[PDB]
Design a binder for this molecule. Sequence first.
Ligand SMILES: [Zn+2]
Length: 79
Amino acid sequence: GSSGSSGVREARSYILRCHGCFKTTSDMNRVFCGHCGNKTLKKVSVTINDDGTLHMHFSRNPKVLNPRGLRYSSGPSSG
Ligand SMILES: [Zn+2]
């Protein structure tokens, strides 16, 4: 399948990521949501890869951690 190419302008592939549900819908004009039905949508940028994946750089979150433990064993006494 032949394929040509001509002057390509600057393109900014973006998307709207909901909150209450956190769902993304292909639309940069819509004001409402479908997943849940929120009345507010936040604009977020997205990168494209040869393969075709979406990456959204988010702000690290506070993920605390708990202390670890250890295991032991035992055996006979005599005989
Ligand atoms: Zn929603």
